Amino acid sequence: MMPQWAYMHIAGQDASEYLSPGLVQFARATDTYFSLGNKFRNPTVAPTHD
Amino acid sequence: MMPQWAYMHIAGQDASEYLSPGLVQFARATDTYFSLGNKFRNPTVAPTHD
Amino acid sequence: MMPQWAYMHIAGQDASEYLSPGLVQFARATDTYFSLGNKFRNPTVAPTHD
Amino acid sequence: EGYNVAQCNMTKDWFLVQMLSHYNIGYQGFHVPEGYKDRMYSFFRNFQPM
Amino acid sequence: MEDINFASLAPRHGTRPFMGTWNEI
Amino acid sequence: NFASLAPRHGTRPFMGTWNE
Amino acid sequence: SKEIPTPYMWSYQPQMGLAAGASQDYSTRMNWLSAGPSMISRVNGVRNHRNQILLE
Amino acid sequence: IGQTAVPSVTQKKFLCDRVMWRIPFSSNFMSMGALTDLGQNMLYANSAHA
Amino acid sequence: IGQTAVPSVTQKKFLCDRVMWRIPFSSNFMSMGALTDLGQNMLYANSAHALDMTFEVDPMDEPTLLYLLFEVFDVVRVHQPHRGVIEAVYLRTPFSAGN
Amino acid sequence: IGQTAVPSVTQKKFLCDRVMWRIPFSSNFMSMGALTDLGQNMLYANSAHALDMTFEVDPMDEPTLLYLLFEVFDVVRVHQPHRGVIEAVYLRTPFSAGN
Amino acid sequence: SSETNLTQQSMPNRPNYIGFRDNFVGLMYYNSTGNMGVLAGQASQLNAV
Amino acid sequence: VDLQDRNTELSYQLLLDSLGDRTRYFSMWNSAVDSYDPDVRIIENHGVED
Amino acid sequence: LYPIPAKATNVPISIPSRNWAAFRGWSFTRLKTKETPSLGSGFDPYFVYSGSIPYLDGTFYLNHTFKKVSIMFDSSVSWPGNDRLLTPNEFEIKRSVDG
Amino acid sequence: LYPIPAKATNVPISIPSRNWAAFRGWSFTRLKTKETPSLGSGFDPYFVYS
Amino acid sequence: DGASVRFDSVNLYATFFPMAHNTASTLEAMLRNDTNDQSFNDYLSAANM
């Protein structure tokens, strides 16, 4: 059921949305020399209808 | 003369402009698994002055 | 000190910012057949604090 | 029935299944996958009919 | 001997979570 | 068979290659 | 020359913690001898503008 | 081969070495997203499947 | 090798042919921009430093040369104000040549 | 080669196998767009021109063929208005087949 | 010519390809003030080089 | 509607070269492009290390 | 360019106090003397050699001959200092013995 | 340490350019080559004296 | 040299995306509208003399 998938990043928000905005700005500003991208899970989910 | 080039997509609008916007949204929504791009001609026209 | 680096394009504005906006439009309008990009210096500058 | 493919022993469903499940290729319709998605452990890099 | 490229503006994913693949109306 | 973040941008040296 | 001078750079003594003497910025000069007055004025305008900042 | 070629049986086979075979649990065998559609249809069960 | 293998010394070396060794004048050795952070760090600037450098190399048994490049900006600005006129202004910095 | 090298003529040639030669009908020989600028140049439009061409080739000592492709648009539009009906409309231009 | 010279042994000469340098390196004077090239306005001979 | 004044076979050969890498053989369509040994077309006679 | 005598293991260099604003760092390698032309002249009588010229062609080699290098501002300001590297005041490129 | 070949009577030495701040002076003496080891070598295979 | 070929059988295979019926019915209704006619152009588009 989703409460557990959301907490564990199997489904729900992307890292660019669940992380505090302060850290997202830090990552965007330092990404060319210190990279924070490989440390946060981004769910991807197939469509269930139509 | 251009009425026929437009109807036959030798000149005039791009596929993103002549198709109904419903079909353009359908294409954008399904393009990773069902691809509609190769079925619509996009004119390209060289500039005639300057 | 920066007055010389700015005049010589070692720091300061990019070519997209110091060229007259008419020329930036001319370049963007002709770039597929006559290419102006490689004739203007773009500074790149490391961050000095933090 | 003629359910083989690809001038070997493999079948029309199993080949459709392996092409879809590695590359999304098997609908609309079979071709050589692009070299960046054809990794070293991928199907079409390694399939050898004889 | 040249083709002129067909097709729309390529895929966009309708990100409620990170990429789904469905929103149409 | 899996993948993460990193596909996000900010590389311009003016406008900013470090901002808080 | 006399009125848009090149600044004297201060050398340092890290042993003693003092200036080590001074001599001009010979190491940072724009080579204008194949430009004309239309741009030499701009080069002098930069060299003047530098000295204003150093005084401030 | 030649005029005196012997009557012959034809043998067909394949090799597919470095691969490991896959079957996606997705309704149409495609990678629409890493959390598949069928893994969300089958979420809830009275007698969760053998 | 085999049962009768002779006792042995191990030698290790490397080759790196077409390269030219580098040391960026940047506080952490990274290319954060072409104009480095240390080149703006106004200590190694206006109040001017002396530099000494020393290298230890394998003895060569023939006369050779150290090739040392001081990496600097070597930029030109070209102005064309009237028909058939080119005024070009050069600045190489640091290590500038020309009044 | 060597001290007894014989006086010599120098010969030059080229090969270009898998290619097919091209001459774009565009005012400056560039692919600015698929519908070229000269193809829009309504002098050589409606008030229709005759074309003469001549080729000089190496004599082949056997019968051969010039293959000449006149590049044109060769487009079809396909309309499917009802269940099981296909109406396809073809226009090749210039060199249209019909009237 | 003699009975013993009948035993001479020949080796092929060493291969030695010769041609112009990559990108014509060395064919034009660069970074040599005694022979500096010129690009200057015809009537206003300030060298741009 | 087909014309004596058309060449679909060559158009398809040219199309595939633009769509992907013709240097990759695919048995399903019997795609394996005609070639010659480049050391045989133009003889590079640098003799022998004897 | 600086000379390295036959059998010389050490190569000391110094440049007197000057501006370092916008400096980018160092690049270096080693060249043979008989393989390097003296471009300071229109012609070079002592350039008795026709192989690659690593000073101009790229084509470096001899990079593996370096043992170590040190950098020192104002004779006492070892660079980068700040106890950055594994023990030193210098860039130890390679080791003949490693405890 | 600087070497002096057998029967030599002169030892010229030089230091190419140097800062002499807090230099205290010169002290010196003469040693036999036999009666002193090299060190920095972990072992001296030529130190045959004791 | 007598090479020869026999065709014992020829069969048309076809493969269908297993599309949701309401989505397929919707897509058909959009593709039947004359605004959305499919169009194609030969890659080697030329007359072949």
DSSP state string for I54-80: EEEE---SS-EEEEEEEE-EEEEEEE-
The residue type found at O12 is: L
Report yes or no: N34 and N41 within 8 Å, Cβ to Cβ: no
**Residue in chain G lying closest to N20 (CA):** G15
Instruction: Show the CA angle centred on residue F10, arms to residues F7 and F12, nearest 5°.
Output: 140
The residue type found at I92 is: R
Report which secondary-structure segment, H or E, holds M28.
strand M25-32
Beta pairing, strands M25-32 & I21-24:
antiparallel
Find which of C13, C14, C18, C49 to mutate to test the F interface (most F CBs within 10 Å of its CB). Answer: C14
Q: Measured between CB atoms, which of M17, M21, M76 is closest to G11? A: M17
Report yes or no: I97 and G27 within 8 Å, Cβ to Cβ: no
- Asked if F17 and C47 come within 8 Å (Cβ–Cβ), the reply is yes
Contact partners for chain O, using 3 or more CB pairs closer than 8 A, are A, B, D, E, H, J, L
**Residue in chain L lying closest to J20 (CA):** L14
CA distances from O19 to E24, M33, O22, O25 (A): 15, 75, 8, 10
How many angstroms separate the CA atoms of C23 and C26, rounded? 5
* Closest C-alpha to J71, from O5, D5, H16, O41: O41
3-state secondary structure of H38: helix
Experimentally, the structure was elucidated by cryo-EM
Task: Give the end-to-end CA distance of chain K in Å, rounded to a whole number.
Answer: 66
> Which residues in chain M are contacts of C1 at CB distance < 8 A?
21
Tell which phi-psi region holds residue O2, choosing left (phi > 0), alpha (psi between -120 and 50) or beta: left
Burial string for M66-88 (b: 16+ CB within 10 Å, else e) reads beebbbbbbbebebbeeeeeeee
Contacts of B36 (CB under 8 A, 6+ apart): B23, B26, B27, B30, E7, E8
> Which residues in chain G are contacts of K47 at CB distance < 8 A?
34
Task: Give the end-to-end CA distance of chain D in Å, rounded to a whole number.
Answer: 20
DSSP-derived letter for residue C18 is H
Beta pairing, strands O38-41 & J73-79:
antiparallel
How many angstroms separate the CA atoms of G38 and G25, rounded? 25
Report yes or no: N34 and N48 within 8 Å, Cβ to Cβ: yes
Q: Measured between CB atoms, which of M12, M75, M97 is closest to N42? A: M97
How many angstroms separate the CA atoms of M34 and A23, rounded? 58
How many angstroms separate the CA atoms of A44 and A9, rounded? 9
The residue type found at E3 is: D
Burial of B40 (0-12, 13-18, 19+ CB in 10 A): buried
Instruction: Show the CA angle centred on residue G39, arms to residues G33 and G40, nearest 5°.
Output: 50
- Asked if N22 and G15 come within 8 Å (Cβ–Cβ), the reply is yes
CA atoms B6, B12, B18, B24: torsion sign: positive
The alpha carbon of residue I12 is apart from the nearest alpha carbon of chain K, in Å, by 33
How many angstroms separate the CA atoms of F2 and E21, rounded? 17
3-state secondary structure of A5: helix
How many angstroms separate the CA atoms of F16 and F13, rounded? 5
Resolution value, angstrom units: 3.3
DSSP per-residue letters across A17-48: HHS-HHHHHHHHHHTTTS--GGGS----B---
> Which residues in chain C are contacts of M22 at CB distance < 8 A?
5, 10
Contacts of M16 (CB under 8 A, 6+ apart): I50
How many angstroms separate the CA atoms of K32 and K36, rounded? 6
DSSP-derived letter for residue E13 is -
The alpha carbon of residue B50 is apart from the nearest alpha carbon of chain E, in Å, by 24
How many angstroms separate the CA atoms of H30 and D17, rounded? 9
Give, to the nearest 10 degrees, the angle between helix O21-31 and helix B21-30.
140
Contacts of A46 (CB under 8 A, 6+ apart): E20, E21, H26, H32, H33, H35, H36, H37, H40
Report yes or no: G25 and G6 within 8 Å, Cβ to Cβ: yes
Task: Give the end-to-end CA distance of chain L in Å, rounded to a whole number.
Answer: 64
Half-sphere exposure of G36 (CA within 13 A, CB side): 16
Strand partners, J71: O46
* Closest C-alpha to B15, from B30, B27, B33, B29: B27
Backbone angles phi, psi at H19, to 5 degrees: -75, 165
Largest CA distance in chain M: 52
What is the layout of strands, in order, in the sheet containing M25-32?
I21-24, M25-32, I64-71, M2-4
Report yes or no: I34 and M57 within 8 Å, Cβ to Cβ: no
CA atoms J60, J64, J70, J73: torsion sign: negative
Q: Where are the alpha helices (DSSP H) in I1-99?
A: none
Report yes or no: M62 and M52 within 8 Å, Cβ to Cβ: no
Cis upstream peptide for I94 (omega within 30°):
yes
How many angstroms separate the CA atoms of N20 and M75, rounded? 10
Report yes or no: A50 and F12 within 8 Å, Cβ to Cβ: no
C-alpha I3 chain-centroid distance: 52
How many angstroms separate the CA atoms of F5 and A27, rounded? 11
DSSP per-residue letters across C24-44: HHHHHHHTTTS--GGGS----
As a three-state string, the secondary structure of chain O is: CCCCCCCCCCCCCCCCCCCCHHHHHHHHHHHCCHHHCEEEECCCCEEEC
How many angstroms separate the CA atoms of J6 and M40, rounded? 40
Strand partners, I53: M13, M71
CA distances from L12 to A19, J33, J36, L8 (A): 51, 22, 23, 6
How many angstroms separate the CA atoms of B30 and B26, rounded? 6
What is the layout of strands, in order, in the sheet containing J73-79?
J87-93, J73-79, O38-41
Strand partners, G10: G22
Contact partners for chain D, using 3 or more CB pairs closer than 8 A, are B, H, L, O
Cis upstream peptide for D29 (omega within 30°):
yes
Report yes or no: E8 and B38 within 8 Å, Cβ to Cβ: no
Find which of M1, M7, M30 to mutate to test the I interface (most I CBs within 10 Å of its CB). Answer: M30
C-alpha M88 chain-centroid distance: 19
Contacts of B16 (CB under 8 A, 6+ apart): B24, B42, E8, E9
3-state secondary structure of O22: helix
Backbone angles phi, psi at I22, to 5 degrees: -130, 155
Tokens matching residue B27: 């294409």
Contacts of D18 (CB under 8 A, 6+ apart): D43, D47, H21, H22
C-alpha M72 chain-centroid distance: 15
Contacts of M9 (CB under 8 A, 6+ apart): I56, I57, I58, I59, M67
Are 3 or more Cβ–Cβ pairs between N and B shorter than 8 Å? no
The residue type found at G25 is: D
Element counts in chain D: helices (H) and strands (E): 2, 1
How many angstroms separate the CA atoms of D27 and B34, rounded? 8
- Asked if A40 and F9 come within 8 Å (Cβ–Cβ), the reply is no
Tokens matching residue G49: 């503008």
Largest CA distance in chain B: 43
Beta pairing, strands M2-4 & D48-49:
unpaired
The residue type found at N9 is: T
3-state secondary structure of I27: coil
3-state secondary structure of J62: coil
Report yes or no: I83 and I60 within 8 Å, Cβ to Cβ: no
Name the one residue in this structure whose structure tokens are 């102006």.
Answer: C36
As a three-state string, the secondary structure of K1-49 is: CCCCHHHCCCCCCCCCCCCCCHHHCCCCCCCCHHHCCCCEECCEEEECC
- Asked if G26 and I81 come within 8 Å (Cβ–Cβ), the reply is no
How many angstroms separate the CA atoms of M99 and M76, rounded? 28
- Asked if F5 and A30 come within 8 Å (Cβ–Cβ), the reply is no
- Asked if H37 and A44 come within 8 Å (Cβ–Cβ), the reply is no
The residue type found at J90 is: Y
Report which secondary-structure segment, H or E, holds G45.
helix G37-55
How many other C-beta atoms are found inside a 10 Å radius of the C-beta of residue N39?
A: 9
3-state secondary structure of M62: coil
**Torsion (CA) M86, M91, M93, M94 in degrees, nearest 10:** -50
Q: Measured between CB atoms, which of A14, A49, A50 is closest to E15? A: A14
Helix, strand, coil distribution of chain F in percent, nearest 5: 20, 0, 80
Tokens matching residue N32: 């036999």
Gaps in chain D (C to N over 2.5 angstroms) fall after none
Report yes or no: M21 and I91 within 8 Å, Cβ to Cβ: no
Contacts of F3 (CB under 8 A, 6+ apart): A42
How many angstroms separate the CA atoms of M7 and I93, rounded? 36
* Closest C-alpha to M9, from M67, M61, M64, M60: M67
Instruction: Show the CA angle centred on residue A29, arms to residues A28 and A34, nearest 5°.
Output: 90
How many other C-beta atoms are found inside a 10 Å radius of the C-beta of residue A46?
A: 23
Contacts of M14 (CB under 8 A, 6+ apart): I50, I51, I52, I53, N16, N17
Tokens matching residue C44: 């790149």
> Which residues in chain O are contacts of J81 at CB distance < 8 A?
32, 34
